[PDB]
Design a protein around this ligand. Structure first.
Ligand SMILES: [Zn+2]
Ligand SMILES: [Zn+2]
Lengths: 122, 132, 108, 48, 322, 98, 75, 94
RNA sequence: GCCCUUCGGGGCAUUUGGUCAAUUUGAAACGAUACAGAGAAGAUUAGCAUGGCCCCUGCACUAAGGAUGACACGCUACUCAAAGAGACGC
């Protein structure tokens, strides 16, 4: 995914996409030769202080968590909470009305999963 | 006296054969000797005996499976959870502070004294309207 | 709804407290939610800084006052000087005769 | 109970737990450690 | 409450013979002899009626700060300032068991009345619960922040109540080895505890204040007031007699129910003792209750008896209700 | 960070050598406040309160250390805990009413 | 002072080597708060003040801290 | 508006509720005291209430302890047991 | 593979097990090096303790030793004023 190289002193940072590929590349090139007859130093990499790299690694953490949460939650709940589709908004109003216009039930009751529950569930 | 192990880890068979060893290993998190529960697998090709790796104190405080060490609710690696859902439980990780914290937590739990989906929804709200 | 406004037979407004939690926030959960004003916070903080500055001035003045020497030197460092002054403060009322025996060169 | 995702084949489980046949000749596995004493249980009010 | 009339106590017999302060005192269940442990590192067995010295036993290298003669077993237990708790077989007059583990000097020792368990308290700030048979420290009752100076065992919850020199009194559930309560009413070191034999109440004594509590709630029942000295001991009869002995030498006999101080004394020191050496270090009633055995800092065992001559009219109850 | 490592090591060494001297806890917490380390300063004060629970001077120092930094909710929690722990100390009640 | 001077002269020279400060038998007090004892929660919320104290710690400035009459007759 | 004519008339304030209690014959979002919409996980202790309906500050004294622990936290625990207004007859028996 | 059978059938026996052998990058250490110069208010010095996120030798986790084993020696406002008299004060 990323191949930062710093030739001025000649040190590289290689960011793969997977744990398995990263460890395979680490243990596959351990003291392995380059074109020049040298012994490479392939360690793990300390986190970069570059604010961008920190921001994008963070964003990867929240998108991974969001992917798992969206897989865990019902798609109806994800759409009804997501608040980008106007159909989702008016569905949210009508479903979390239960009559009594202007109620707008709390999230702890409206977005509640249980055995009995008060929702379409799934 | 029973491990907290997710169905991903307990191999296939509803009738499972499990071994128990008191002080069988040190916790991978808090480095204190605990009771190891090691079961069989879905193949007799490598007898690794997928076992517990963290103690019930560290299993309970960080709320994760003992074998695979990922979350019980969402199934996240536990740092992904504590960094994206945020707060909950940082947990010390140093030399003496680690066993100090674990010692005090176990002492409290043995002596009786002691909203994840809410922060999941708040995470959804921080991410749905976000822009890089 | 906590305060009820009534008009008596004499024709004046009387506010009656249904609870007892008007003048005091005891027996009232809303005490957990009160925010003090920024001006009052600044006032309290500035008062604390004034007390701290006065204590620092007192410390410096005490150091300067004890740094001035008067009379004979009977010590070798500052801890010895403080101990000898404490000894004086306690024991001058008992060793006056020996004190004048040294100041005189003869009998107690 | 519920878990990370969903359920697949069977829920109820029958588990056979036996102790592990440990080598009689093995010494203790792990070195003991010197940890400072924990904080006390919270003190009571001073009812003087 | 109107107090009962109790006859005043007077000095009967003075027994010299130790060469250090008499810190311990323990009567046989059969009331024939009593045991004085003292600062001359020795345990003396004295006949109770004649007062004569029967035997001297030496096994401690420091002052003997505690004694107990077992009512079920032919044993006598002792503790001392030498970190040692010993079990003496009285069919041989020899130490047969050690109970090791106290980090520093041991101040008190009691036996559980029903089951075969020994509780000791010590300057390492802790009350260790031992098994008699296997000498194994089954419980380490910890939580005090100072010397455990006194201690009582009881047949029902709270089974162990410890009073410490950091002024708190903790009641301990013996099955779990953890405390069920803390009583912080005392201002200074609680040196004395005593349990009433028929009522489910007890008393703790610090300097100046003797507070009376209810088991198991630890409910503050009343306050013996007036004895403005460091209280070392406490002794209740079957007939509701509290004895507060005090390190300045002051003696107070109270009625247990009302709190009325029906007698106040100062004890007397031996020929040769300094006025600083006037003070009560230990006290116990015998099994009958007719005698009070005190041991004092003039190295003296004293026996105190009730005055049979005195009538309810010769010493009327000068109790003024308020 | 290296200077803070030295100072923390020295202060914790003196905590470990004499835990009953209050000046060690006070100087350590004061120094950590001057570094604007508020969680660490609170931790030092709380551990000192573990060692000396009924000390009025320590309680007032921790309350005033959190009042000088405008942590009003923190300090009011502290004052409730202080007058709960020590109900018969007039200074803590006076400080809370003031 | 000598080692610090050499360190700042080599850091500005381009070379950067960190040295093992982790002696055995001793603790690193900078990795995390040593023997943490967090303040107990009371009846007042402290969340915004905790966030503000963390903001103050994060933006703490290293550049603002530096260490190290009358006559004799009348008296 | 007394019984049974509140139709059409909607309450707008808690004083419109009388002394309080939502009116079940008017379909509208009624709140007899106020709104607790969303508190952002405010980590304060929940203010509980004692037996007589007052604020309880022993929840600070009992914090970090088990429920079966005896804790003296009030002035009532300083009173002699006979002089407390709870009871007068106590069985002091083993 | 055996055994029984009324030749349809049936029986006996039933789930082992610690990343693999694979020495850098999952953790062993002294020596050696430049040194160093064994506590108690002058000099030379016998020790016995104390406290533990300091240990070592030892069966001793109820001896003893390791320089009395070493460590200790630094730092120092903060429960905090009151009267009296002075000021081309304000
Ligand atoms: Zn663990
Ligand atoms: Zn798992």
């Amino acid at each position: 995914e990323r191949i930062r190289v710093l030739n001025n002193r000649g040190v590289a940072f290689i960011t793969y996409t997977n744990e398995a590929n990263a460890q395979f590349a680490k243990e596959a090139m351990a003291h392995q030769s380059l074109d020049h007859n040298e012994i490479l130093n392939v360690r793990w990499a300390t986190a970069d202080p570059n604010p961008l790299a920190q921001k994008r690694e963070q964003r990867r953490i929240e998108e991974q968590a969001a992917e798992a949460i969206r897989r865990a939650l019902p798609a109806e709940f994800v759409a009804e909470i997501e608040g980008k589709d106007p159909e989702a908004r008016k569905r949210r109003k009508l479903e979390s009305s239960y009559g009594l216009e202007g109620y707008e039930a709390p999230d702890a009751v409206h977005f509640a999963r249980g055995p009995n529950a008060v929702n379409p569930r799934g | 006296d029973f491990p907290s192990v997710c169905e991903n880890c307990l191999p296939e068979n509803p009738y499972v054969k499990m071994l128990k060893e008191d002080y069988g290993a040190e916790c991978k998190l808090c480095t204190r000797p605990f009771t190891v529960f090691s079961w069989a697998g879905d193949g007799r090709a490598h007898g690794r005996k997928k076992r517990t790796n963290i103690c019930l104190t560290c299993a309970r405080l960080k709320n994760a499976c003992q074998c695979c060490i990922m979350d019980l609710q969402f199934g996240l690696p536990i740092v992904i959870r504590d960094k994206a859902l945020e707060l909950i439980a940082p947990g010390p990780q140093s030399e003496i502070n680690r066993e100090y914290f674990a010692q005090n937590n176990e002492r409290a739990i043995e002596e009786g004294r002691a909203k994840t989906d809410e922060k999941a929804r708040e995470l959804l709200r921080r991410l749905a309207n976000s822009k890089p | 709804g906590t305060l009820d406004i009534i008009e008596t037979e004499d024709g004046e407004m009387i506010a009656v407290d249904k609870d007892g939690t008007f003048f005091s926030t005891a027996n009232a959960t809303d005490f957990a939610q009160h925010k003090p004003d920024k001006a009052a916070v600044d006032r309290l903080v500035a008062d604390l800084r004034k007390a701290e500055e006065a204590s620092l001035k007192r410390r410096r003045e005490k150091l300067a006052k004890s740094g001035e020497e008067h009379g004979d030197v009977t010590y070798i460092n500052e801890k010895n000087k403080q101990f000898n002054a404490k000894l004086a403060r306690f024991y001058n009322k008992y060793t006056a005769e020996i004190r004048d025996s040294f100041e005189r060169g003869t009998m107690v | 109970s519920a878990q990370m995702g969903n359920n697949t084949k069977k829920q109820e489980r029958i588990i056979k737990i036996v102790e592990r046949q440990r080598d009689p000749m093995e010494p203790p596995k792990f070195k003991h450690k010197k940890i400072p004493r924990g904080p006390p249980s919270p003190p009571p009010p001073v009812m003087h | 409450p109107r107090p009962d009339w109790h006859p005043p106590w007077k000095l009967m017999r003075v027994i010299s013979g130790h060469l250090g302060w008499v810190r311990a005192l323990a009567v046989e269940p059969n009331n024939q002899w009593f045991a004085s442990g003292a600062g001359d590192r020795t345990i003396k067995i004295w006949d109770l009626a004649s007062g004569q010295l029967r035997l001297t036993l030496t096994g401690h290298i420091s002052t003997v700060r505690g004694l107990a003669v077992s009512p079920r077993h032919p044993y006598m237990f002792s503790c001392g300032e030498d970190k040692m708790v010993k079990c003496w077989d009285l069919e041989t007059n020899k130490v047969i068991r050690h109970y090791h583990g106290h980090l520093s000097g041991v101040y008190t020792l009691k036996l559980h009345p029903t089951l075969d368990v020994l509780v000791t308290g010590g300057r390492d700030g802790v009350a260790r619960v031992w098994d008699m048979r296997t000498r194994s420290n089954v419980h380490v009752l910890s939580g005090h922040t100072g010397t455990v100076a006194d201690l009582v065992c009881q047949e029902a919850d709270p089974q162990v109540i410890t009073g410490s020199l950091d002024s708190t009194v903790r009641m301990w559930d013996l099955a779990a080895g953890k405390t069920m309560g803390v009583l912080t009413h005392h201002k200074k070191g609680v040196r004395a505890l005593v349990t009433h034999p028929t009522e489910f109440t007890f008393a703790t004594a610090s300097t100046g204040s003797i507070k009376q509590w209810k088991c198991p709630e630890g409910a503050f029942m009343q306050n013996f007031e007036g004895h403005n000295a460091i209280i070392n001991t406490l002794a209740v009869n079957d007939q509701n007699v509290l004895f507060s002995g005090g390190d300045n030498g002051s003696m107070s006999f109270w009625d247990w129910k009302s709190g009325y101080r029906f007698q106040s004394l100062d004890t007397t020191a031996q020929p040769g003792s300094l006025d600083a050496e006037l003070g009560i270090m230990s006290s116990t009633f015998d099994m009958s209750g007719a005698r009070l055995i005190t041991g004092e800092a003039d190295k003296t065992i004293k026996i105190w008896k009730e005055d049979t001559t005195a009538t309810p009219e010769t010493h009327p109850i000068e109790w003024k209700p308020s | 960070k290296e200077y803070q490592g030295r100072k923390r090591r020295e202060f914790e060494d003196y905590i470990r050598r004499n835990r009953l001297r209050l000046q060690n806890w006070f100087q350590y917490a004061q120094w950590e406040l001057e570094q604007k380390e508020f969680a660490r300063a609170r931790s030092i004060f709380e551990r000192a309160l573990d060692v000396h629970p009924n000390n009025t001077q320590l309680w007032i120092r921790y309350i005033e250390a959190e009042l000088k930094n405008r942590n009003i909710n923190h300090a009011r929690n502290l004052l409730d805990r202080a007058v709960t722990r020590l109900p018969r100390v007039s200074k803590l009640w006076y400080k809370y009413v003031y | 002072l000598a080692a610090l001077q050499k360190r700042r002269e080599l850091k500005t020279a381009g070379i950067n080597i960190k040295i093992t400060t982790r002696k055995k038998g001793q603790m690193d007090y900078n990795a995390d708060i040593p023997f943490e004892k967090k303040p107990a929660p009371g009846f007042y919320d402290t969340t915004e003040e905790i966030a503000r104290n963390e903001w103050q710690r994060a933006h703490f400035d290293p550049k603002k801290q530096q260490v190290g009459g009358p006559s004799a007759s009348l008296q | 508006p007394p019984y049974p004519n509140r139709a059409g008339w909607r309450p707008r304030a808690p004083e419109d509720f009388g002394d309080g209690g939502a009116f079940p014959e008017i379909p509208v979002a009624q709140y007899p005291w106020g709104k607790n919409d969303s508190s952002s996980k405010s980590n304060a202790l929940v203010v509980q209430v004692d037996s007589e309906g007052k604020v309880d500050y022993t929840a600070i004294a009992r914090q970090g302890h088990s429920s079966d622990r005896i804790i003296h936290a009030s002035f009532k625990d300083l009173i002699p047991l006979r002089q407390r207004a709870e009871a007068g007859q106590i069985d002091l028996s083993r």
